[PDB]
Amino acid sequence: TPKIQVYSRHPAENGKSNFLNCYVSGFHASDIEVDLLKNGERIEKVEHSDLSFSKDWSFYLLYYTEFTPTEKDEYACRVNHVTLSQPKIVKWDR
Amino acid sequence: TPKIQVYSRHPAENGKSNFLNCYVSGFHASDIEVDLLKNGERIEKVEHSDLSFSKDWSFYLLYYTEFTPTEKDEYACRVNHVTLSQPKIVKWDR
Amino acid sequence: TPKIQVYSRHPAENGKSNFLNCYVSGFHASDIEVDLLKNGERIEKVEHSDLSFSKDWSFYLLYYTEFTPTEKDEYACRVNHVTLSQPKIVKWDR
Amino acid sequence: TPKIQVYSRHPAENGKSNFLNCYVSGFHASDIEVDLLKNGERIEKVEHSDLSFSKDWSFYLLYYTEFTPTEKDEYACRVNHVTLSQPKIVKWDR
């Protein structure tokens, strides 16, 4: 299954603007679906940068969006594919 | 229409191994088709590296393969898309 | 000697914001120096992205700045390198 | 201080060829020094890919080597930086 890493650009501070990132990487998988979730809900208009190499069928995806973390709010990265029996959800931990 | 640049990795020398590259870049175009041609014929098993950014709908594609240029042989890059009325062919010039 | 390409991000339109780029690539960066010029003067607000690989000692540099092209202004890229007898100045061909 | 991640390209299998990676990232590279170690000894056949951006002074370094993991051998990455009181050694957790 693809490697999934979830992290903020700068050290996380409540009420301070930051970037949420989900880095998805691996081999032998096309048409991967990636979403960022806020309190279980899909965040719309998330940007992404995609890199792939045919030589080893590798892919490296970065999904990111500007955000301001708080105590009440929980974030995660949701990855889906045909290879997966169910969407793989990875919670963000500061 | 996408920018297309065709070039060898090292200075071209007849009968000397090298890499043929076609660099295709632009904005607002998905599912672009790229082929390298030898004497008008599609070269099979060409590798490629693909990079794209959603922020500006940009793409940067590098199609490459190992080759040995000669006097008799002519090479080109063929790019196609729905946006194009006909495949755009760009001949390699040493 | 290093390869030098000077180009705008989008087709130039006088009076409209754009980015001017100088892409410098080659092997053995050594004492490489790159600057963008306006009417012969160094542009202050220039940033750069640098990529290098020790395997083949290749380097790929992108020097860039936001700019507003006009009919009267001349832009160029100045490059100095050990392999050059004197600094090379490549004019932006609109 | 710089972020340091040590990992193999594919899941480790004893006796099977793989790549060991040390990914070092942060802001203001300055006098950064990176090495891969086997049983405390510097590995000679290490290459690296370096990416940096002047906009935010970010840097992203990938130091890598082909290796054949075994049960007995210990690998690590050594990093020295101005922001570190002494060089940091991060062991590869298989």
UniProtKB/Swiss-Prot annotation, chains A, B, C, D:
Record text on subunit structure and interactions: Heterodimer of an alpha chain and a beta chain. Beta-2-microglobulin is the beta-chain of major histocompatibility complex class I molecules. Polymers of beta 2-microglobulin can be found in tissues from patients on long-term hemodialysis. B2M alone (not in complex with HLA-I) interacts with M.tuberculosis EsxA (ESAT-6) and an EsxA-EsxB (CFP-10) complex; the tripartite complex can be detected in the host endoplasmic reticulum. The B2M-EsxA complex can be detected in patients with pleural tuberculosis and is stable from pH 4.0 to 8.0 and in the presence of 2M NaCl.
GO MF term (any one): identical protein binding
Protein name: Beta-2-microglobulin
Upper classification of the organism: Eukaryota, Metazoa, Chordata, Craniata, Vertebrata
Disease named in the record: Immunodeficiency 43: A disorder characterized by marked reduction in serum concentrations of immunoglobulins and albumin, and hypoproteinemia due to hypercatabolism. Patients may suffer from recurrent respiratory tract infections and severe skin disease. Amyloidosis, hereditary systemic 6: A form of hereditary systemic amyloidosis, a disorder characterized by amyloid deposition in multiple tissues resulting in a wide clinical spectrum. AMYLD6 is mainly characterized by gastrointestinal and cardiac symptoms. Neurologic involvement, sicca syndrome, and carpal tunnel syndrome may also be present. Inheritance is autosomal dominant.
Keyword match Transmembrane: no
Outcome following mutation: W57G: Decreases tendency towards amyloid formation
Annotated GO biological process: amyloid fibril formation; antigen processing and presentation of endogenous peptide antigen via MHC class I; antigen processing and presentation of exogenous peptide antigen via MHC class II; antigen processing and presentation of exogenous protein antigen via MHC class Ib, TAP-dependent; cellular response to iron ion; cellular response to iron(III) ion; cellular response to nicotine; intracellular iron ion homeostasis
Parent-record interval covered: 24 to 117 of 119
GO cellular component, one term: ER to Golgi transport vesicle membrane
